[PDB]
Tab-separated table of C-alpha atoms and ligand atoms in Angstrom:
chain	number	residue	atom	x	y	z
A	1	UNK	CA	2.606	-4.705	22.863
A	2	UNK	CA	4.073	-7.313	20.509
A	3	UNK	CA	7.767	-7.542	19.621
A	4	UNK	CA	7.427	-5.161	16.633
A	5	UNK	CA	5.837	-2.178	18.375
A	6	UNK	CA	8.901	0.022	18.116
A	7	UNK	CA	9.806	-0.969	14.556
A	8	UNK	CA	6.198	-0.161	13.667
A	9	UNK	CA	6.421	3.280	15.310
A	10	UNK	CA	9.606	4.051	13.406
A	11	UNK	CA	8.153	3.000	10.022
A	12	UNK	CA	4.964	4.953	10.644
A	13	UNK	CA	6.898	8.046	11.795
A	14	UNK	CA	9.149	7.969	8.741
A	15	UNK	CA	6.074	7.841	6.541
A	16	UNK	CA	4.466	10.780	8.335
A	17	UNK	CA	7.728	12.751	8.076
A	18	UNK	CA	8.746	11.954	4.482
A	19	UNK	CA	5.961	10.187	2.604
A	20	UNK	CA	3.275	12.823	3.154
A	21	UNK	CA	5.341	15.689	1.654
A	22	UNK	CA	4.016	17.207	-1.551
A	23	UNK	CA	6.052	16.448	-4.667
A	24	UNK	CA	4.305	18.767	-7.191
A	25	UNK	CA	7.262	21.162	-6.943
A	26	UNK	CA	9.861	18.345	-6.779
A	27	UNK	CA	11.535	17.595	-10.147
A	28	UNK	CA	13.111	14.531	-8.497
A	29	UNK	CA	9.736	12.806	-8.930
A	30	UNK	CA	8.737	11.973	-12.439
A	31	UNK	CA	4.966	12.240	-12.938
A	32	UNK	CA	4.201	9.137	-15.034
A	33	UNK	CA	0.405	8.905	-15.137
A	34	UNK	CA	-2.327	11.437	-14.317
A	35	UNK	CA	-6.027	10.603	-14.375
A	36	UNK	CA	-7.797	13.593	-12.804
A	37	UNK	CA	-6.962	13.757	-9.072
A	38	UNK	CA	-4.995	10.484	-9.379
A	39	UNK	CA	-1.316	11.353	-9.920
A	40	UNK	CA	1.290	8.597	-10.046
A	41	UNK	CA	5.001	9.362	-9.829
A	42	UNK	CA	8.218	7.315	-9.836
A	43	UNK	CA	11.951	7.741	-9.405
A	44	UNK	CA	14.092	5.665	-11.747
A	45	UNK	CA	16.327	3.783	-9.309
A	46	UNK	CA	18.380	0.616	-9.842
A	47	UNK	CA	20.504	-1.313	-7.411
A	48	UNK	CA	22.906	-3.874	-8.811
A	49	UNK	CA	20.931	-3.840	-12.072
A	50	UNK	CA	17.622	-4.412	-10.284
A	51	UNK	CA	14.847	-1.823	-10.711
A	52	UNK	CA	13.738	-0.458	-7.301
A	53	UNK	CA	11.796	2.555	-8.716
A	54	UNK	CA	10.082	4.265	-5.704
A	55	UNK	CA	6.363	4.718	-6.469
A	56	UNK	CA	4.440	7.619	-5.023
A	57	UNK	CA	0.829	8.431	-5.854
A	58	UNK	CA	-1.757	10.910	-4.641
A	59	UNK	CA	-5.497	10.753	-5.064
A	60	UNK	CA	-8.757	12.358	-3.940
A	61	UNK	CA	-11.792	10.106	-3.481
A	62	UNK	CA	-15.279	11.516	-2.811
A	63	UNK	CA	-17.608	9.958	-0.330
A	64	UNK	CA	-15.245	7.968	1.901
A	65	UNK	CA	-13.138	8.672	4.955
A	66	UNK	CA	-9.505	7.850	5.596
A	67	UNK	CA	-10.636	5.539	8.377
A	68	UNK	CA	-12.823	3.609	5.935
A	69	UNK	CA	-10.162	3.550	3.204
A	70	UNK	CA	-7.556	2.194	5.663
A	71	UNK	CA	-9.849	-0.432	7.216
A	72	UNK	CA	-10.624	-1.743	3.737
A	73	UNK	CA	-6.970	-1.678	2.735
A	74	UNK	CA	-5.967	-3.451	5.959
A	75	UNK	CA	-8.777	-5.938	6.445
A	76	UNK	CA	-7.654	-9.371	5.154
A	77	UNK	CA	-11.286	-10.424	4.851
A	78	UNK	CA	-12.043	-8.201	1.859
A	79	UNK	CA	-8.585	-8.593	0.296
A	80	UNK	CA	-9.817	-10.955	-2.479
A	81	UNK	CA	-12.571	-8.495	-3.442
A	82	UNK	CA	-10.140	-5.892	-4.752
A	83	UNK	CA	-6.729	-7.577	-5.236
A	84	UNK	CA	-6.021	-8.730	-8.805
A	85	UNK	CA	-2.297	-9.595	-8.670
A	86	UNK	CA	-2.274	-12.048	-5.731
A	87	UNK	CA	-2.186	-15.824	-6.216
A	88	UNK	CA	-2.330	-16.749	-2.518
A	89	UNK	CA	-1.981	-15.155	0.887
A	90	UNK	CA	-1.846	-16.518	4.395
A	91	UNK	CA	-1.926	-14.697	7.740
A	92	UNK	CA	1.265	-15.958	9.424
A	93	UNK	CA	0.847	-14.318	12.794
A	94	UNK	CA	-1.564	-12.018	14.619
A	95	UNK	CA	0.479	-9.501	16.611
A	96	UNK	CA	-2.362	-7.274	17.847
A	97	UNK	CA	-5.821	-6.288	16.696
A	98	UNK	CA	-4.271	-3.667	14.389
A	99	UNK	CA	-1.181	-5.654	13.307
A	100	UNK	CA	-0.576	-8.949	11.496
A	101	UNK	CA	2.161	-10.602	9.458
A	102	UNK	CA	1.151	-11.802	5.989
A	103	UNK	CA	2.650	-14.146	3.419
A	104	UNK	CA	1.464	-13.788	-0.171
A	105	UNK	CA	2.396	-14.908	-3.636
A	106	UNK	CA	2.013	-12.690	-6.665
A	107	UNK	CA	0.702	-13.886	-10.010
A	108	UNK	CA	3.641	-14.615	-12.295
A	109	UNK	CA	4.392	-11.950	-14.854
A	110	UNK	CA	6.102	-13.616	-17.811
A	111	UNK	CA	8.922	-13.943	-18.182
A	112	UNK	CA	10.073	-13.180	-14.644
A	113	UNK	CA	9.858	-15.791	-11.901
A	114	UNK	CA	7.083	-15.576	-9.363
A	115	UNK	CA	7.609	-13.313	-6.346
A	116	UNK	CA	6.422	-13.830	-2.798
A	117	UNK	CA	6.373	-11.352	0.073
A	118	UNK	CA	6.399	-11.580	3.865
A	119	UNK	CA	5.315	-8.442	5.606
A	120	UNK	CA	3.842	-6.885	8.730
A	121	UNK	CA	0.699	-4.923	8.051
A	122	UNK	CA	-0.379	-2.336	10.655
A	123	UNK	CA	-3.193	0.213	10.689
A	124	UNK	CA	-2.830	3.324	12.908
A	125	UNK	CA	-4.633	6.603	13.614
A	126	UNK	CA	-2.248	9.569	14.033
A	127	UNK	CA	-4.007	12.325	16.057
A	128	UNK	CA	-4.015	15.855	14.669
A	129	UNK	CA	-0.791	17.574	15.768
A	130	UNK	CA	-2.810	20.757	16.421
A	131	UNK	CA	-6.569	21.331	16.266
A	132	UNK	CA	-5.671	23.045	12.971
A	133	UNK	CA	-4.284	19.927	11.337
A	134	UNK	CA	-6.067	16.801	9.990
A	135	UNK	CA	-5.988	13.474	11.717
A	136	UNK	CA	-4.370	10.855	9.493
A	137	UNK	CA	-5.072	7.147	9.124
A	138	UNK	CA	-2.174	5.078	7.785
A	139	UNK	CA	-1.624	1.483	6.787
A	140	UNK	CA	1.997	0.456	6.630
A	141	UNK	CA	3.006	-2.825	5.023
A	142	UNK	CA	6.715	-3.576	5.443
A	143	UNK	CA	8.801	-6.723	4.979
A	144	UNK	CA	9.883	-8.671	8.104
A	145	UNK	CA	11.618	-11.998	8.747
A	146	UNK	CA	9.571	-14.849	10.195
A	147	UNK	CA	10.238	-18.506	11.085
A	148	UNK	CA	6.821	-19.685	9.799
A	149	UNK	CA	7.751	-18.424	6.326
A	150	UNK	CA	6.729	-21.040	3.696
A	151	UNK	CA	9.159	-22.832	1.399
A	152	UNK	CA	8.102	-21.794	-2.144
A	153	UNK	CA	10.674	-22.958	-4.665
A	154	UNK	CA	8.745	-21.219	-7.470
A	155	UNK	CA	9.180	-17.821	-5.767
A	156	UNK	CA	11.813	-15.067	-5.296
A	157	UNK	CA	11.257	-13.151	-2.073
A	158	UNK	CA	10.474	-9.502	-2.774
A	159	UNK	CA	10.827	-6.879	-0.028
A	160	UNK	CA	8.376	-4.031	0.368
A	161	UNK	CA	7.716	-0.880	2.283
A	162	UNK	CA	4.257	0.388	1.355
A	163	UNK	CA	2.090	2.993	3.093
A	164	UNK	CA	-1.432	4.146	2.368
A	165	UNK	CA	-1.837	7.502	4.112
A	166	UNK	CA	-5.239	9.149	4.323
A	167	UNK	CA	-6.565	12.541	5.419
A	168	UNK	CA	-10.238	13.388	5.280
A	169	UNK	CA	-11.784	16.777	4.475
A	170	UNK	CA	-15.416	17.475	5.247
A	171	UNK	CA	-17.740	20.367	4.313
A	172	UNK	CA	-26.041	15.453	9.341
A	173	UNK	CA	-22.802	15.246	7.348
A	174	UNK	CA	-23.428	13.394	4.120
A	175	UNK	CA	-21.057	11.343	1.923
A	176	UNK	CA	-21.550	14.138	-0.640
A	177	UNK	CA	-19.468	16.393	1.566
A	178	UNK	CA	-16.541	14.113	2.393
A	179	UNK	CA	-13.260	13.911	0.421
A	180	UNK	CA	-10.453	11.450	1.271
A	181	UNK	CA	-6.958	12.607	0.260
A	182	UNK	CA	-4.653	9.624	-0.266
A	183	UNK	CA	-0.918	9.453	-0.460
A	184	UNK	CA	0.222	5.943	-1.432
A	185	UNK	CA	3.907	5.001	-1.509
A	186	UNK	CA	5.470	1.649	-2.465
A	187	UNK	CA	9.168	0.869	-2.312
A	188	UNK	CA	9.577	-2.664	-3.679
A	189	UNK	CA	12.780	-4.628	-4.042
A	190	UNK	CA	11.773	-7.508	-6.409
A	191	UNK	CA	14.841	-9.491	-5.392
A	192	UNK	CA	16.777	-11.715	-7.723
A	193	UNK	CA	16.771	-10.518	-11.248
A	194	UNK	CA	13.874	-9.509	-13.415
A	195	UNK	CA	14.015	-7.667	-16.790
A	196	UNK	CA	13.917	-3.952	-16.102
A	197	UNK	CA	11.413	-3.427	-18.926
A	198	UNK	CA	9.064	-5.925	-17.316
A	199	UNK	CA	9.260	-4.396	-13.802
A	200	UNK	CA	8.567	-0.933	-15.149
A	201	UNK	CA	5.705	-2.043	-17.389
A	202	UNK	CA	4.072	-3.968	-14.539
A	203	UNK	CA	4.370	-0.949	-12.242
A	204	UNK	CA	3.091	1.518	-14.804
A	205	UNK	CA	0.091	-0.708	-15.543
A	206	UNK	CA	-0.740	-2.196	-12.127
A	207	UNK	CA	-0.374	0.785	-9.740
A	208	UNK	CA	-3.018	3.029	-11.459
A	209	UNK	CA	-5.251	-0.016	-11.950
A	210	UNK	CA	-4.882	-0.936	-8.295
A	211	UNK	CA	-5.616	2.605	-7.052
A	212	UNK	CA	-8.604	3.101	-9.341
A	213	UNK	CA	-9.997	-0.317	-8.509
A	214	UNK	CA	-9.338	-0.270	-4.782
A	215	UNK	CA	-10.721	3.228	-4.215
A	216	UNK	CA	-13.813	2.418	-6.302
A	217	UNK	CA	-14.422	-0.697	-4.208
A	218	UNK	CA	-14.307	1.465	-1.055
A	219	UNK	CA	-16.808	3.944	-2.502
A	220	UNK	CA	-19.072	1.070	-3.503
A	221	UNK	CA	-18.915	-0.897	-0.226
A	222	UNK	CA	-19.473	2.190	1.923
A	223	UNK	CA	-22.164	4.089	0.007
A	224	UNK	CA	-25.426	4.213	1.971
A	225	UNK	CA	-23.632	3.101	5.147
A	226	UNK	CA	-23.210	5.419	8.188
A	227	UNK	CA	-19.923	7.308	7.829
A	228	UNK	CA	-17.112	5.835	9.894
A	229	UNK	CA	-14.837	8.818	10.625
B	1	A50	C1	8.305	-9.648	-11.803
B	1	A50	C2	7.214	-9.018	-10.928
B	1	A50	C3	7.840	-8.718	-9.574
B	1	A50	C4	6.692	-8.278	-8.667
B	1	A50	C5	7.309	-7.419	-7.578
B	1	A50	C6	6.223	-6.915	-6.649
B	1	A50	C7	5.863	-7.697	-5.518
B	1	A50	C8	4.868	-7.190	-4.651
B	1	A50	C9	4.222	-5.950	-4.898
B	1	A50	C10	3.232	-5.378	-3.970
B	1	A50	C11	2.376	-4.346	-4.381
B	1	A50	C12	1.416	-3.764	-3.517
B	1	A50	C13	1.403	-4.273	-2.210
B	1	A50	S1	0.279	-3.508	-1.062
B	1	A50	O1	-0.057	-2.194	-1.634
B	1	A50	O2	0.978	-3.625	0.235
B	1	A50	C14	-1.355	-4.356	-0.997
B	1	A50	C15	-1.111	-5.796	-0.482
B	1	A50	O3	-0.823	-6.661	-1.574
B	1	A50	C16	2.239	-5.279	-1.750
B	1	A50	C17	3.171	-5.842	-2.647
B	1	A50	C18	4.614	-5.165	-6.011
B	1	A50	C19	5.608	-5.655	-6.889
B	1	A50	C20	6.011	-4.815	-8.089
B	1	A50	C21	5.102	-5.140	-9.310
B	1	A50	C22	3.680	-4.792	-9.008
B	1	A50	C23	3.269	-3.440	-8.908
B	1	A50	C24	1.925	-3.145	-8.593
B	1	A50	C25	1.053	-4.230	-8.372
B	1	A50	C26	1.540	-5.539	-8.474
B	1	A50	N1	2.837	-5.840	-8.783
């Protein structure tokens, strides 16, 4: 029990309530990119002339579990093996063995100024509501304030609320018979000002690239390892 336990529970619960819902029938979501099972949607939202566009994506990855996907997403030690848009990150504080606070800087995208982020990252297993329902693994990354926040005069502080939410279907169980269903949501306030066209182009390019790359890394690192359910 660190000082964020209840904020964490609230963020996680909101994601389980709202983020998991299907949006196939919801015209409010614009489907922007589809590549097979990977479906990437946005809402066009601006606040004070700053693009906030909520991002929501679903995906189905063979041969990995939600537990594996989330560990890989959460574990700072493999971060540099799949991240492409990060200049630097530092663990600011270890809250618990499933929760840390991270500082990171994002590669500049011309012509906007560089962004940095300060966020709590927590991984949690949500037990099946009923023996009918799936268990879910979730990673939530959400912005928090912290005293040990670096001075970075090059950077505008973005604020994020991101969740990677995983449920695993299975048919000795082999990788051949396991499917991981992902819902990934990212609400990012870039702060300051950045050209709308830039923000939307970066999102449209980088989210599908991230999801394809990250999931493929998980498949590759796990294949021929015992399944971690
Ligand atoms: C002018 C560019 C402004 C960049 C704004 C920004 C800042 C941070 C993020 C971002 C994206 C994914 C995460 S995470 O999924 O939690 C994994 C940990 O890194 C945390 C933060 C996103 C974005 C929006 C632009 C953009 C979109 C997808 C990739 C990169 N940049």
